[PDB]
Design a binder for this molecule. Structure first.
Ligand SMILES: [K+]
Length: 460
């Protein structure tokens, strides 16, 4: 991604936006009970913890684009991925405004708690003021679409969340680039049936895990991804590193499904508003907004195919099975490929890819050490076709030590329990006892292991 334009907002017909510079994260009642070293992310230039300039850190996400063109290997990649997708017989017709608001089969209802974006943020107008959920009345929304129109700047919010210590010093706090409700409605209106089909068919034909429930989906992964060689790897700054050429490739895949392509240009060449700065960037996917997860997944599908083609002169793409969730990816081939060779092919395109899970070098992977959506794989000891999604124990301890809303510790703890029991019985009873080593913890309800185990079985 490359900042092409950076000017004062008032010079480009726009107001200054006011960023909350104060974390809601506060030490929880379990802070001293569990070990950890994560702290709330930096949200101001005035921050004792900093050791770098803050403004530079936020925008280094946009390093620049390499010189490259849509090559032959990409052309084969889009043809191959498109044939898979033509198999699903997706309806390329648009959906109705009411269905984009209140949801359809496969496409859940619009979240009414996320911000409505520009210009509503400037005048206190929230999503619930435009859309009434009990009346199902959306008169104000219709009024607001005609009035303010379409193709509005994305407001960039700092992400108030826990980070590792190293990332506090270096100013590495993440960003979300939230689109106006007017634009998310427009993308849902045009691409709604695409998103729907993807959500109902997670797996190796869509090549996506978007919308999946890992509690059931994990058992299905090892049958979809057959073939001896299990592969995965990490991307450094996936969103911001995606060259325009992958957006071109994406548009062609959508055209092969009979959708219009024009709207993807608004993600590739995007408009942004941070504080008092209007800026435009070429390349990069805007992190976390208008149907972003699905397009990121489709791009990853094009990238994996393309990189494997670049690395291996002889490959059968039909046996290259791929499951992606944005930048997260797990995949397989019918015999052993070299992850390091495939990784090296990313450099010419401006992609930086390294060994999976912070690993020092590329190592062979199977189901005892492979990770997807941060989760390992662990079979049930009785019914070995039922696979537990294993969540990392350290992240759970880290999360429970902090809170944005102390009155909701019960809900926070329930979330962590559903994650933790998969790791094992003994580990879960250890977590439970430590919670209950303190007054506030004894007061909370903790689901018995056997409750969780049978809720899980009564789910297949
Ligand atoms: K962009």
């Amino acid at each position: 991604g490359q900042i092409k334009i950076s000017k004062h907002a008032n010079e480009c017909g726009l107001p200054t936006i006011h960023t909350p510079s104060k974390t809601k994260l506060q030490p929880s009642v379990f802070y001293d009970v569990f070990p950890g070293s994560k702290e709330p992310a930096v949200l101001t230039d005035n921050d004792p913890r900093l050791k770098v300039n803050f403004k530079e850190a936020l925008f280094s996400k946009y390093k620049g684009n390499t010189e490259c063109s849509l090559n032959q290997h990409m052309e084969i990649a889009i043809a191959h991925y498109s044939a898979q997708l033509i198999t699903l017989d997706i309806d390329s017709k648009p959906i109705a405004l009411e269905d984009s608001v209140f949801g359809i089969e496969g496409l859940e209802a619009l979240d009414l708690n996320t911000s409505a974006g520009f210009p509503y943020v400037t005048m206190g107008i929230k999503k619930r003021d435009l859309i009434n959920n009990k009346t199902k009345d959306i008169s104000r929304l219709k009024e607001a679409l005609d009035k303010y129109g379409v193709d509005l700047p994305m407001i960039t919010f700092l992400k108030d969340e826990l980070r590792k210590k190293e990332k506090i010093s270096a100013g590495k706090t993440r960003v979300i680039e939230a689109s106006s409700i007017n634009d998310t409605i427009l993308f849902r209106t045009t691409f709604g049936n695409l998103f729907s089909k993807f959500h109902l068919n997670p797996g190796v034909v869509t090549g996506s895990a978007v919308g999946c429930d890992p509690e059931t989906f994990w058992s299905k992964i090892p049958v979809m991804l057959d073939g001896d060689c299990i592969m995965a790897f990490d991307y450094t700054n996936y969103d911001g590193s995606i060259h325009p050429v992958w957006f071109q490739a994406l548009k062609k895949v959508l055209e092969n499904l009979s959708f219009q392509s024009n709207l993807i240009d608004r993600l590739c060449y995007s408009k942004h508003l941070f504080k008092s700065t209007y800026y435009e960037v070429a390349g990069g996917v805007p992190s976390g907004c208008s149907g972003t997860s699905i397009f990121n997944t489709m791009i990853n599908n094009i990238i994996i195919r393309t990189l494997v083609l670049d690395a291996y002169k002889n490959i059968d793409l039909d046996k290259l099975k791929i499951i992606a969730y944005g930048d997260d990816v797990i995949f397989s081939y019918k015999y052993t490929l070299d992850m390091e060779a495939i990784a090296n092919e990313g450099k010419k395109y401006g992609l930086t890819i390294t060994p999976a899970d912070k690993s020092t070098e590329f190592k062979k992977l199977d189901y005892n050490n492979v990770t997807f959506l941060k989760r390992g794989f662990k079979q049930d000891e009785k019914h070995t076709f039922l696979i537990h999604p294993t969540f990392p124990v350290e992240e759970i301890y880290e999360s429970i030590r902090w809170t944005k809303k102390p009155s909701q510790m019960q809900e926070h703890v329930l979330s962590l329990c559903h994650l933790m029991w998969h790791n094992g019985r003994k580990v879960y009873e250890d977590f439970s006892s430590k919670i209950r080593s303190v007054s506030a913890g004894r007061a909370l309800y903790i689901p018995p292991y056997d409750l969780l185990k049978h809720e899980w079985y009564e789910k297949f």
